[PDB]
């Protein structure tokens, strides 16, 4: 392992190398990024529920609107 | 080390309402920075004028 700060310093020092490094070094997995997925059991449950089955929309409508606004 | 620290400050995190909502990573971070002091009877901690830094 290598501490980011030190690495950054090194990169700054060797400017021509930095670009090359960037080009080359593909991380096998970024710990920053989220992965979007569902579990199969949950899906099954949802499906099961599907076969079974407006006034309180206004307290939540506002929230939805806010969310939408945030999105942009 | 982090785990050990967490264990040490279990009396803090479990009792107080502040840290019940706190995340695990956050807790870990906190634990590292938490000292612990065993003050004697009649042994004052903060004195009038001293810097409140903790």
């Amino acid at each position: 392992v290598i501490k980011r700060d030190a690495l950054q310093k090194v990169l700054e020092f060797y400017t021509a190398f930095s670009h090359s490094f960037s080009r080359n070094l593909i991380l096998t997995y970024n710990l920053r990024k989220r992965i979007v997925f569902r579990k199969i059991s949950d899906v099954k449950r949802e499906e099961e529920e599907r076969m079974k089955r407006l006034p309180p929309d206004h307290p939540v409508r506002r929230l939805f609107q806010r969310f939408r606004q945030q999105k942009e | 080390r982090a785990d050990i620290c967490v264990h040490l400050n279990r009396k803090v995190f479990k009792e107080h309402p502040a840290f019940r909502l706190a995340s695990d990573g956050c807790l870990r971070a906190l634990a590292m920075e938490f000292q612990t002091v065993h003050c004697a009877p009649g042994d004052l901690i903060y004195h009038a004028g001293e810097s409140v830094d903790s």
Binding site: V36, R38, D42, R45, L63 | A22, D24
Partner: protein, 142 residues
């Protein structure tokens, strides 16, 4: 909701025989112990007032409605609580992502799964794929 479950001790204390049915005699005895001697008619009337079934007695479920009536929570609390209830289809103090999706579907406002996940993440702090009451309140206030 939570503290109403801790009330059961009182109910137990009230019941002398231990049948889950508050008799008039027991009530009378309790009153006597306290240091007040009202008539049995009054007791009967009281019983009639609160109980639903009306079989010279009442259970804890019967009491529950009365307790609820007594409570009188805050307006914001009432609103927020209602919202929470609507969200949580099962009713276990926690709202899953699937549940949220279902509620959205029911409502009509359609969104992507990724978006929903993001929203959940924003809501949550401790990181357990779920949201508490406190956490929920974070979004409504600010």
């Amino acid at each position: 909701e939570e503290q109403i479950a801790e009330f059961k001790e009182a109910f137990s204390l009230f019941d002398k025989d231990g049948d889950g049915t508050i008799t008039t005699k027991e009530l009378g005895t309790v009153m006597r112990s306290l240091g007040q001697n009202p008539t049995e008619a009054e007791l009967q009337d009281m019983i009639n007032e609160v109980d639903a079934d009306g079989n010279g007695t009442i259970d804890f479920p019967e009491f529950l409605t009365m307790m609820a009536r007594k409570m009188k929570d805050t307006d914001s609390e009432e609103e927020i609580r209602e919202a929470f209830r609507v969200f949580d289809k099962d009713g276990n103090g926690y709202i899953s992502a699937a549940e949220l999706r279902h509620v959205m579907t029911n409502l009509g406002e359609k969104l992507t799964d990724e978006e929903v996940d993001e929203m959940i993440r924003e809501a949550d702090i401790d990181g357990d794929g779920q949201v508490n009451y406190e956490e929920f309140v974070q979004m409504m206030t600010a």
